[PDB]
């Protein structure tokens, strides 16, 4: 059962999550359901609407050397910028997890290096439905079919994330569940190269324990929701392993698809 120290751990993880992530599930579902506004996001569903959307982003695109690259390269330059922002928010989120900042700096780097994209793809589900995903802070909606329509290999990047997201979203998690889930992802004792594995495993056990009790209380009828989420954690590691492999393939065969430096150091020597 859930004692006071455990409720407090769950509360500060939930608060750290609401503070650090501009987009979260309650905000995304309000946009995607369109029940708070008859002004829906601009839909990007083909090359013409992409180019319309990019007339808005012109100064940013011209900021880098991106405005004249292939559409596939422009799209995933913007997706990278989003990833960079989320890594920055996840780093702040992690430092607020009790015990994370006490770790050796090397272990903090390792946890984030291997954790952020598992967390990214888990939280990405919040802004996805079967037909597309919210972009540009919820102001745009880029369709699944348009992403599938791009040329190889750029058309293979997102579809597995949609596939994960549809099954993940069927669990009906709310932000309080997701914050603990993401905290469990980050505080993973398995990561290659970790030094103080005993102490991280200890930290993970407490978070995963709170996750389990929180789920049993918040979703009492879904008896095996915790086992289901354990499996989703395994699925995310495999999702991320394959994503890293695709990023490596693109980095070798695509002269024009540069990697942001922060993501470059995340992917370097990953899997």
């Amino acid at each position: 059962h859930m004692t006071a120290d455990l409720k407090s751990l769950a509360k500060r993880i939930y608060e750290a999550y609401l503070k650090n992530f501009n987009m979260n599930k309650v905000k995304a579902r309000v946009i995607l359901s369109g029940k708070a506004s008859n002004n829906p996001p601009f839909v990007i569903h083909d090359m013409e609407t992409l180019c319309m959307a990019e007339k808005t982003l012109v100064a940013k695109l011209v900021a880098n050397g991106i405005q004249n690259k292939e559409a596939e390269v422009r799209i995933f330059h913007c997706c990278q910028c989003t990833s960079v922002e989320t890594v920055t928010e996840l780093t702040e989120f992690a430092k607020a997890i009790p015990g994370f900042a006490n770790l050796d700096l090397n272990d903090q780097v390792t946890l984030l290096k291997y954790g952020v994209y598992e967390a990214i793809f888990a939280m990405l589900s919040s802004v996805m439905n079967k037909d597309g995903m919210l972009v540009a802070y919820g102001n745009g909606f880029i369709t699944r079919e348009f992403l599938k329509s791009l040329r190889k290999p750029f058309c293979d990047i997102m579809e597995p994330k949609f596939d994960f997201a549809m099954k993940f979203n069927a669990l009906e998690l709310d932000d309080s569940d997701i914050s603990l889930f993401v905290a469990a992802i980050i505080c993973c004792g398995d990561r290659p190269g970790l030094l103080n594995v005993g102490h991280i495993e200890k930290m993970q056990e407490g978070i995963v324990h709170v996750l389990r009790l929180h789920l049993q209380s918040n979703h009492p009828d879904d008896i095996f929701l915790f086992p289901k989420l354990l499996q989703k954690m395994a699925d995310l590691r495999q999702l991320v392993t394959e994503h890293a492999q695709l990023v490596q393939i693109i980095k070798k065969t695509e002269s024009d698809a540069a990697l942001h430096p922060l993501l470059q150091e995340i992917y370097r020597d990953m899997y």
């Binding site: 890594v87 920055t88 780093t91 702040e92 430092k95 700096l105 090397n106 903090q108 780097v109 390792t110 984030l112 290096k113 190269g193 430096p261 922060l262 150091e265 995340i266 370097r268 020597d269």
Partner: peptide
């Protein structure tokens, strides 16, 4: 391992 992750390391200390 921190030489190989300069930006991450900077955000963590920040």
């Amino acid at each position: 391992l921190t030489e190989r992750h300069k930006i991450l390391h900077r955000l963590l200390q920040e």
